[PDB]
Design a protein around this ligand. Sequence first.
Ligand SMILES: CC(=O)SCCNC(=O)CCNC(=O)[C@H](O)C(C)(C)COP(=O)(O)OP(=O)(O)OC[C@H]1O[C@@H](n2cnc3c(N)ncnc32)[C@H](O)[C@@H]1OP(=O)(O)O
Ligand SMILES: CC(=O)SCCNC(=O)CCNC(=O)[C@H](O)C(C)(C)COP(=O)(O)OP(=O)(O)OC[C@H]1O[C@@H](n2cnc3c(N)ncnc32)[C@H](O)[C@@H]1OP(=O)(O)O
Ligand SMILES: [Mg+2]
Ligand SMILES: [Mg+2]
Lengths: 436, 431
Amino acid sequence: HHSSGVDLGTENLYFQSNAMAGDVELADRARRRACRLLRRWLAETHTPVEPGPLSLRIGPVRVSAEVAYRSPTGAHGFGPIRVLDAEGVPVALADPVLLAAACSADSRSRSLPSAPINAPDAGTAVDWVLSSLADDEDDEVPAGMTAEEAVRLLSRQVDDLPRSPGADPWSLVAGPFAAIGRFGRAGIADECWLLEVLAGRLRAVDDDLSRSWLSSPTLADRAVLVGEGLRYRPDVRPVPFDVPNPLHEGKSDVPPPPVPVLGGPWSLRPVEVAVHGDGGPDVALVHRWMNTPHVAHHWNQAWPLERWREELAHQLGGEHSLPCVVGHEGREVAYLELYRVTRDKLAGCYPYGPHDLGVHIAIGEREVLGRGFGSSLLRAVAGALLDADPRCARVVAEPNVHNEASVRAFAKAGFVREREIGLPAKNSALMVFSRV
Amino acid sequence: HHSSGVDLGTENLYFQSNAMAGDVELADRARRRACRLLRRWLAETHTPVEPGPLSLRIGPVRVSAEVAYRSPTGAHGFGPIRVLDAEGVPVALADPVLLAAACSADSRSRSLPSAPINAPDAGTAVDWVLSSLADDEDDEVPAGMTAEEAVRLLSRQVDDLPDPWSLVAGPFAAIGRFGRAGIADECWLLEVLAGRLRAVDDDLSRSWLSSPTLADRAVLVGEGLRYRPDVRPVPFDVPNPLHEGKSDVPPPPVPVLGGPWSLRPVEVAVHGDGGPDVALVHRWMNTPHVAHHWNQAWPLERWREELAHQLGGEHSLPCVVGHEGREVAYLELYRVTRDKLAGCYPYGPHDLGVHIAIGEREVLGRGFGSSLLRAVAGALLDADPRCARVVAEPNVHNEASVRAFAKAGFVREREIGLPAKNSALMVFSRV
Ligand SMILES: CC(=O)SCCNC(=O)CCNC(=O)[C@H](O)C(C)(C)COP(=O)(O)OP(=O)(O)OC[C@H]1O[C@@H](n2cnc3c(N)ncnc32)[C@H](O)[C@@H]1OP(=O)(O)O
Ligand SMILES: CC(=O)SCCNC(=O)CCNC(=O)[C@H](O)C(C)(C)COP(=O)(O)OP(=O)(O)OC[C@H]1O[C@@H](n2cnc3c(N)ncnc32)[C@H](O)[C@@H]1OP(=O)(O)O
Ligand SMILES: [Mg+2]
Ligand SMILES: [Mg+2]
């Protein structure tokens, strides 16, 4: 009767409808995976998240979703994750493997070509995700759970952290904190309150690990999408990285960046923003420098003049960043930002000491310079900062691993490349100039 | 007022609803994409399709979908495409990028490490799919279209043709979309198309009406595929729906080998354990070098049932080859017009193929194989004077067998995509 299809009876419709029943749950399962990946991408890239629209370039795709619930531990709750074309039209929903592809494309690109993540036998997060679709579905948190019972689970879990000398430091983030986020995202309890409770369970035992977890400004977590050392042989061989420690004070009495005094051919002074008019010649110099191509290619801050005026005034009015004009034998040639790490984005990336100072650098008169200037200046600045503040342990910097002139200039000046770090727009070599 | 969320007013909900309105359309577009990809995969691997359930291995995932509409041109209509775990439970919906990833893995593996598809710089179908998400999507066939307008548009399109894959990619594509839309029966539209080809007597039209295969362009399967962001497709042969062969082709003949060689059909005894021949093949088929390639290291009863099945039909003829009195190999001699190979190259009706396993290479693996292949081919060409070719389809990865065939006078003509493997189409031609 039918040649291009099957002849239909009610029994056939019954069979197919009991199959299409479960598709709804299959839909939710993909949503949860994609939500997990995005949480990781944001965590491993130290991308700031706040409620409302989140908009994000990840590899080759514009990505956008509503942050319905912002989580203190990073367990954000998302609206539909959508893919956008160049002008904001949604073109797709971000399925788990679509994200795994965008992130793998983005990550492999963030790291250097010679990195392990880019070895031919290395595999990709796509392989990892594809391989795990049949894996066991973790129980989501029962919506009716009581905060009382939530604390009971957390206290029990906290007390089961390895009383062991060689024990995993990511245990705290991967065990208890993960639970806290699932509790908050489920609407079961406020995560700050749960964290406060966990601090209490940690204070009760003065174990070495317990006390450091209360005192360190960062904690160990494990990355699965961002990091030069990643492999996905079949599954992921994750790599450790530092995330902010929520159990640790949010401001301190650390004074602003000092104004160092440099040796040799170098002069240094803070920028001055005139309150009258368009800002003055210092604002003009930075604006001009920051819009030249060789600078803008790395800083990506080729803004209009008034935007730079407010930035410099903004920095100068605070305790974070100190913008400076550097001169070489009387000619003004470079711009610096010297900043307190404890108030910078870098503070969530490595175990900083309270007085750490960092530097951003741009040589603006590159129309003539690239002749040993940067490394000599960088060296002077580091020793000069260590002289200005004897409670500072390190001067640090975050050049893009691809910014090969900056990285080499930093190391010629005596910085040591400790590790790669994932930042929102780039992966950076954490260069460290250490005291004595 | 809320610390971890946004304070909601009705205006915020309005903004979010015109977004979720379009989400439904975002779902269908993924569905249309995934169905387009699966159509290509099935075509380019020559995987057989009939209505009802289709179940299929693609790279690292079991894949399963209902075939609601079986298309003469391959534009099949699917239910939900689902991914299944090892014991049949669905675990995911086969989203478009998921498919391109599984197919990329499967294809890169099917082709040789030296193939362009496997170069470090080649890019992957994943790159191609992601890069095209932002494309403006081609319009669907107007659901209210009349069959007349279907014919009018098709005739106009046929008449504006000159490349050989122009037919499958132009007219057949429309027939597939017309059919899948329910506008007209594809068999009727294909018949109309045939007439418009008779109307012009040029070599091009005549070949299209007479050849058992047509040229199509592949985008997932092929040693030569490149994805410089965009895909650089490669040609392959698909079955020709406009062709049905007069056929009347007899079963495979029994060749007579010269020199040190003897050949005879297998015998399967009734009621016992199949006799001694069923045992010898089963013994051979389970030794490591044989099972490593044939993947037919079965128990004894499946081979009894297997060989009996072949001998009773017009497809395959199982034979035992002896060399100077020692039985040393197993052959399957088969008619191409009845084999999986018939959708893969422009076959002649009497073409014959051969599968071979040398079981006593563990005692007689010393240069014999190519020489036996040479004898068998010429003896088959003697047995069927209407046969044009002897062919074989070893896995492109089985380079020892390929080399043995070419030493015996077969030519490695092309790579072809078969349901489980890519094969070197080795051809011994009477020319
Ligand atoms: C917010 C932010 O953007 S974070 C701030 C970090 N960003 C930056 O530092 C980018 C600033 N852009 C610039 O152009 C910077 O002024 C610089 C530091 C990168 C210029 O410094 P330079 O004048 O080039 O210093 P210098 O001449 O000493 O260069 C040192 C090394 O760079 C290497 N180098 C120079 N150019 C290149 C290049 N194109 N590729 C690779 N290495 C290079 C030089 O060979 C030298 O190494 P060497 O010891 O073997 O000779
Ligand atoms: C579904 C299916 O079953 S697909 C059917 C196709 N069959 C298969 O895929 C599996 C085949 N399995 C077998 O065991 C096959 O019989 C073989 C061909 C692989 C056995 O044959 P062989 O014993 O290797 O024959 P032979 O040694 O002559 O091989 C000839 C090739 O090897 C070389 N060779 C190797 N040893 C010798 C030798 N001792 N003397 C001369 N030539 C030799 C020949 O020069 C020739 O070409 P090459 O130099 O380019 O490699
Ligand atoms: Mg019916
Ligand atoms: Mg409200």
